[PDB]
Design a protein around this motif. Structure first.
Motif, PDB file in Angstrom:
ATOM      1  N   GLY A  39      -4.055  10.069  -4.272  1.00  7.05           N
ATOM      2  CA  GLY A  39      -4.362   9.404  -3.022  1.00  7.05           C
ATOM      3  C   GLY A  39      -5.309   8.227  -3.167  1.00  7.05           C
ATOM      4  O   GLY A  39      -5.588   7.734  -4.263  1.00  7.05           O
ATOM      5  N   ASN A  40      -5.810   7.771  -2.020  1.00  8.66           N
ATOM      6  CA  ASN A  40      -6.683   6.606  -2.011  1.00  8.66           C
ATOM      7  C   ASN A  40      -8.051   6.953  -2.578  1.00  8.66           C
ATOM      8  O   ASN A  40      -8.658   7.961  -2.204  1.00  8.66           O
ATOM      9  CB  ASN A  40      -6.836   6.037  -0.601  1.00  8.66           C
ATOM     10  CG  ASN A  40      -7.109   4.544  -0.622  1.00  8.66           C
ATOM     11  OD1 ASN A  40      -7.321   3.999  -1.700  1.00  8.66           O
ATOM     12  ND2 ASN A  40      -7.105   3.863   0.533  1.00  8.66           N
ATOM     13  N   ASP A  83      -4.512   3.578  -3.855  1.00 10.19           N
ATOM     14  CA  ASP A  83      -3.956   4.911  -4.005  1.00 10.19           C
ATOM     15  C   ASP A  83      -3.626   5.193  -5.463  1.00 10.19           C
ATOM     16  O   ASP A  83      -3.319   4.288  -6.242  1.00 10.19           O
ATOM     17  CB  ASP A  83      -2.702   5.068  -3.148  1.00 10.19           C
ATOM     18  CG  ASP A  83      -1.798   3.859  -3.220  1.00 10.19           C
ATOM     19  OD1 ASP A  83      -2.172   2.881  -3.900  1.00 10.19           O
ATOM     20  OD2 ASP A  83      -0.716   3.884  -2.598  1.00 10.19           O
ATOM     21  N   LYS A 114       0.809  -1.211   0.000  1.00 12.92           N
ATOM     22  CA  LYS A 114       0.000   0.000   0.000  1.00 12.92           C
ATOM     23  C   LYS A 114       0.846   1.266   0.000  1.00 12.92           C
ATOM     24  O   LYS A 114       0.622   2.160  -0.823  1.00 12.92           O
ATOM     25  CB  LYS A 114      -0.939   0.003   1.209  1.00 12.92           C
ATOM     26  N   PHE A 146     -10.097   0.067  -2.048  1.00 11.30           N
ATOM     27  CA  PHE A 146      -9.420   1.340  -1.854  1.00 11.30           C
ATOM     28  C   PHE A 146      -7.974   1.205  -2.302  1.00 11.30           C
ATOM     29  O   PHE A 146      -7.198   0.452  -1.705  1.00 11.30           O
ATOM     30  CB  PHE A 146      -9.494   1.787  -0.398  1.00 11.30           C
ATOM     31  CG  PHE A 146     -10.802   2.408  -0.027  1.00 11.30           C
ATOM     32  CD1 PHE A 146     -11.682   2.829  -1.009  1.00 11.30           C
ATOM     33  CD2 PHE A 146     -11.148   2.586   1.301  1.00 11.30           C
ATOM     34  CE1 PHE A 146     -12.888   3.408  -0.675  1.00 11.30           C
ATOM     35  CE2 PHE A 146     -12.354   3.164   1.643  1.00 11.30           C
ATOM     36  CZ  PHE A 146     -13.225   3.576   0.653  1.00 11.30           C
ATOM     37  N   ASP A 161      -9.623  10.966  -2.105  1.00 10.25           N
ATOM     38  CA  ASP A 161      -9.189  11.664  -0.900  1.00 10.25           C
ATOM     39  C   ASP A 161      -8.528  12.997  -1.233  1.00 10.25           C
ATOM     40  O   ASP A 161      -8.723  13.988  -0.520  1.00 10.25           O
ATOM     41  CB  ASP A 161      -8.253  10.765  -0.092  1.00 10.25           C
ATOM     42  CG  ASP A 161      -6.998  10.401  -0.852  1.00 10.25           C
ATOM     43  OD1 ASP A 161      -6.877  10.813  -2.020  1.00 10.25           O
ATOM     44  OD2 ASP A 161      -6.139   9.694  -0.287  1.00 10.25           O
TER      45      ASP A 161
HETATM   46  C1  LIG Z   1      -6.917   4.189   1.936  1.00 11.83           C
HETATM   47  O1  LIG Z   1      -8.097   4.658   2.543  1.00 11.83           O
HETATM   48  C2  LIG Z   1      -8.061   4.395   3.930  1.00 11.83           C
HETATM   49  C3  LIG Z   1      -9.442   4.585   4.514  1.00 11.83           C
HETATM   50  O2  LIG Z   1      -9.502   3.978   5.783  1.00 11.83           O
HETATM   51  C4  LIG Z   1      -6.975   5.271   4.567  1.00 11.83           C
HETATM   52  O3  LIG Z   1      -6.815   4.978   5.936  1.00 11.83           O
HETATM   53  C5  LIG Z   1      -5.629   5.012   3.893  1.00 11.83           C
HETATM   54  O4  LIG Z   1      -4.655   5.939   4.292  1.00 11.83           O
HETATM   55  C6  LIG Z   1      -5.751   5.091   2.373  1.00 11.83           C
HETATM   56  N1  LIG Z   1      -4.519   4.715   1.740  1.00 11.83           N
HETATM   57  C7  LIG Z   1      -3.768   5.554   1.005  1.00 11.83           C
HETATM   58  C8  LIG Z   1      -2.511   4.947   0.435  1.00 11.83           C
HETATM   59  O5  LIG Z   1      -4.063   6.723   0.804  1.00 11.83           O
END
Ligand SMILES: *[C@@H]1O[C@H](CO)[C@@H](O)[C@H](O)[C@H]1NC(C)=O
Length: 935
Positions: free
Chosen positions: A143-144, A139, A98, A137, A172
């Protein structure tokens, strides 16, 4: 790092072919689109697991310029773009599957960085699962978000073909951005009324689980008036990868653990892409003669676009070229720009056109007090202050540097430039211009604390001014309080004491040195001063120091309590002598420490120096004076008859007061400043007398100025997630532009006259998403609907050969009455070009009527009757008056032909010719061709 996070094998490079097309426009209505093709050869080096290196070459960009067939070519920006592409390699980390990290080159430009980020964003592929359809989900460059693991088709164990959706409205990093909006300016509602998603597919290989070929497309549609979320202003960007080969340890570690999250970059174009900005001003030159001011608001919108994409260096370089064509339009454009560089520009122009430099210095002084400094504006205010060196300029710079240090304590080279400039101004020991040296000392006595970390020479130079008596006594003293706000160093204190003990030193100088030292008192210096004072000769400084000792010993403040205790311990052997009459003796009235200092020459009693403190260093009032004792003695030392003659014989009065608040010297006024004010009033009287001369230029006539005022009432521009990597900005601007073209040109002696100033108003709803690659390319189509109205008439009255012809010129350009309906335009990086209007169902209605003989009141329009209007297509609604040609214009002619056949003819010249003629002798003729009653 998971066992099977990635679908790629290390020690096996990857030759891929990346492509992208940023098409934009309105589907269904037409097919011609604003697109920016781009492709490149991508070398994916694989040092190890979850560790990658990016290289790219042959990054060629293609531009749309025709259809039959999307015509494509090579931009002038393409070569340097590919040079930047191949300039550096990138490093990629994806530990734990991730977490993803970017290792860029330190000097690699940020826009190039996010370009590479967008390119590599699609390269990620999630491992398979039992469920063919899945949503996860994952990225991206923003972002995610919610990806859609959808097996296109599976071989059971594997699924080379696959598809994924990411609705970009649910990311996000979906936050908008701030933009260089107009200063006289809604984000979430704009997000609601727009679409943003990607939907696409990918092909792995069964042999090695590596992506054979991937394709992605996106959608970004203006939701209002859209047809089934599938027609209207939409932006569809492609991103395709094509494998070509998979050829064959160490991983390059980057210090900057950059994140894949997009970095905001201001939309910009290089001078090569900003060359036409001058033509961007030449366009409004055309309406000087063409006078078709319908498009003026659109032109001003183009100005806004180019200035938003402009560069400070270029605009600063070519400001005079900007201003030469017409000043006020350029000025108002700079005002409405909303870009920081504009703030620097006008005064640089202003001194360039000697537009009353006094008020120029005044306004620069006013603006220098802002709490939001910029380095470039600091440089230019420094330069202009060096140019004119007026009191306002120097005080402005003095406050501006302190403001910049307070806001930005971090040091910069321009501060050193200012410091060495100042030490050049004082040369060695302040032998330069006396008043200028005084003013620059007043300046430095404010930010020398800021510059204390910069140059140690600060003190070293000014003590040379302090010690050397070559400058006059006033500047000599000013050298001391140049250090007044300065923390005294040990060398400074020792030099101060050595100059201090000098009996030949003037009493005011010695007292000022004493105060400067006692700022940071030393026990040994206090002891020697105490032991010397009984044999001290200068009575008034003795009274002053005794008063200061009383002030400290009686200072109820606990802060000075320890100092009072120390001084009492020192004075235990012998206390201070008696205090003299503070009414007529120099004594420190350090009354929250409010200090009164009324010091004079021990010879006289009138205090030459009158210093008042207030306390941070709240307020500082000072005044040094001399040349007034003879004035007092003129009568104090029948009389009026001799006094009148003795008036001129008196010694020249010489006074100078000053005020310094919060450390910064606010300002000083002297008798020299008073006679300067007298000279300024003389100049003002000359200016007032100049208007009788200016009436000659007024009557010179022969002029025409297009007084058109622009404004933007709505400014909501930002940036939202761009799948194409290249930024997806969002422009929204409602622009109003009224005005009239007024100019004077006539000849009274020749009996010449005319009418001018037909006013008109225009509206532009310039709104879309900007598909612009900063400094590289721009694409998209803003909404183009114009609400324009035309008004005002123009005439022409002359006289020659006795013929008093009073022409009523019907303009060659038919006069409009109202304009409405959309007329869109495909906007390119090079130049926007008109979007062709629709043909079918566009009822080309045209209701015309020759209401008046020779003129036609008419109107026309067309719109197809499947997006909601105006997204349905082009709309026309134009009401106007046009000359029918049968009458080119009217004219009332009259000549006193003695016989007298004094004609009075209302000739309507043209193909037709109707006129009321009157020639009287009595010949009572009354001619009406329309009813033909030609009596
Ligand atoms: C993916 O989304 C989750 C939602 O719980 C978040 O905590 C996480 O940081 C996200 N991952 C990235 C790589 O942005």
């Amino acid at each position: 790092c998971p066992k099977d996070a990635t679908r790629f094998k290390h020690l096996r490079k990857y030759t891929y072919n990346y492509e992208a097309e940023s098409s934009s426009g309105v589907p269904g209505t037409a097919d011609s689109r604003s697109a920016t093709r781009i492709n490149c050869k991508v070398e994916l080096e694989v040092p190890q697991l979850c560790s990658f290196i990016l290289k790219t070459s042959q990054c060629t960009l293609k531009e749309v310029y025709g259809f039959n067939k999307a015509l494509l070519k090579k931009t002038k920006n393409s070569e340097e773009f590919a040079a930047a592409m191949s300039r550096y390699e990138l490093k990629l980390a994806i530990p734990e599957g991730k977490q993803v990290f970017l290792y860029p080159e330190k000097d690699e430009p940020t826009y190039i960085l996010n370009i590479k980020r967008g390119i590599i964003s699609a390269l990620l592929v999630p491992p398979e699962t039992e469920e063919a359809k899945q949503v996860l989900f994952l990225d991206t460059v923003y972002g995610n978000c919610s990806t859609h693991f959808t097996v296109k088709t599976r071989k059971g164990n594997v699924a080379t073909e696959i598809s994924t959706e990411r609705d970009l409205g649910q990311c996000d990093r979906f936050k908008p951005i701030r933009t260089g909006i107009s200063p006289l300016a809604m984000t979430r509602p704009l997000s609601t009324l727009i679409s943003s998603s990607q939907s696409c597919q990918y092909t792995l290989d069964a042999k090695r689980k590596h992506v054979a070929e991937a394709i992605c497309k996106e959608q970004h549609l203006f939701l209002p008036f859209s047809y089934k979320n599938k027609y209207g202003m939409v932006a569809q960007v492609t991103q395709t990868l094509k494998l070509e080969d998979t050829p064959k340890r160490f991983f390059g570690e980057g210090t900057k653990k950059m994140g894949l999250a997009f970095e905001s970059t201001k939309s910009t174009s290089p001078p090569k892409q900003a060359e036409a900005v001058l033509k961007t001003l030449q366009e409004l030159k055309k309406l000087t003669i063409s006078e078709q001011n319908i498009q003026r608001a659109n032109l001003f919108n183009k100005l806004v676009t180019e200035l938003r994409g402009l560069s400070d260096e270029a605009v600063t370089s070519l400001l005079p070229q900007l201003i030469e064509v017409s000043s006020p339009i350029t000025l108002q454009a700079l005002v409405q720009c909303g870009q920081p560089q504009c703030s620097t520009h006008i005064l640089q122009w202003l001194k360039r056109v000697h537009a009353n430099p006094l008020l120029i210095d005044v306004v620069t002084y006013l603006v220098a007090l802002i709490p939001e400094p910029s380095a470039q504006q600091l440089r230019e205010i420094f330069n202009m202050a060096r140019d004119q060196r007026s009191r306002a300029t120097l005080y402005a710079l003095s406050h501006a540097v302190n403001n910049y240090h307070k806001t930005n304590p971090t040091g910069t080279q321009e501060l050193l430039d200012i410091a060495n400039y100042l030490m050049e101004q004082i040369q060695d020991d302040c032998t330069g211009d006396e008043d200028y040296t005084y003013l620059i000392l007043r300046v430095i006595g404010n930010m020398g604390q800021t510059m204390e970390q910069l140059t140690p020479e600060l003190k070293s130079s000014i003590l040379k001014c302090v010690q050397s008596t070559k400058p006059s006594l006033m500047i000599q003293k000013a050298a001391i309080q140049a250090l007044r706000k300065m923390e005294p160093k040990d060398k400074d204190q020792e030099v101060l004491l050595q100059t201090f003990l000098d009996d030949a030193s003037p009493g005011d100088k010695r007292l000022a040195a004493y105060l400067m030292l006692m700022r940071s008192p030393s026990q040994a210096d206090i002891n020697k001063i105490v032991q010397i004072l009984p044999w001290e000769q200068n009575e008034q400084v003795k009274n002053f120091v005794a008063s200061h000792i009383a002030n400290i010993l009686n200072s109820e403040e606990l802060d000075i309590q320890d100092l009072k205790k120390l001084v009492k311990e020192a004075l235990k052997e012998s206390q201070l002598p008696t205090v003299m009459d503070f009414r007529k003796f120099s004594r420190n009235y350090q009354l929250a420490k409010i200090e009164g200092n009324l010091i004079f020459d021990p010879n006289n009693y009138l205090p030459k120096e009158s210093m008042l403190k207030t306390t941070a260093d709240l307020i500082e009032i000072g005044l040094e004076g001399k040349g007034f004792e003879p004035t007092l003695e003129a009568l104090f030392g029948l009389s009026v008859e001799k006094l009148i003659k003795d008036l001129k014989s008196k010694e020249v009065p010489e006074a100078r007061a000053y005020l310094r608040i919060l450390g910064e010297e606010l300002g000083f006024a002297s008798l020299h400043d008073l006679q300067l004010l007298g000279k300024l009033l003389l100049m003002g009287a000359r200016t007032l007398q100049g208007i009788p001369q200016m009436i000659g230029e007024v009557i010179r006539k022969g002029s025409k100025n297009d007084f058109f005022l622009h404004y933007i009432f709505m400014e909501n521009a930002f940036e939202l997630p761009t799948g194409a990597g290249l930024q997806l900005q969002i422009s929204s601007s409602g622009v109003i532009a009224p005005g009239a073209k007024a100019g004077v040109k006539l000849e009274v002696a020749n009996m010449q006259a005319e009418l001018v100033a037909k006013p008109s108003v225009s509206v532009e709803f310039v709104t879309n998403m900007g598909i612009i690659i900063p400094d590289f390319a721009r694409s998209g189509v803003q909404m183009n609907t114009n609400f324009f109205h035309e008004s005002g008439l123009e005439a022409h009255v002359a006289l020659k050969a006795g013929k008093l012809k009073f022409i009523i010129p019907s303009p060659k350009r038919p006069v409009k009455l109202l304009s409405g309906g959309n007329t869109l335009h495909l906007v390119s990086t090079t130049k926007t070009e008109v979007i062709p209007p629709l043909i079918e169902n566009r009822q080309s209605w045209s209701v015309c009527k020759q209401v008046f003989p020779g003129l036609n009141y008419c109107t026309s329009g067309a719109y197809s009757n499947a997006s909601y209007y105006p997204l349905t297509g082009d709309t026309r609604l134009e009401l106007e008056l046009r000359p029918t040609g049968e009458i080119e214009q009217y004219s009332v002619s009259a000549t006193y032909e003695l016989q007298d056949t004094l004609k009075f003819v209302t000739q309507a010249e043209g193909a037709k010719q109707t006129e009321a003629t009157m020639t009287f002798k009595l010949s009572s003729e009354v001619q009406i061709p329309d009813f033909d009653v030609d009596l």
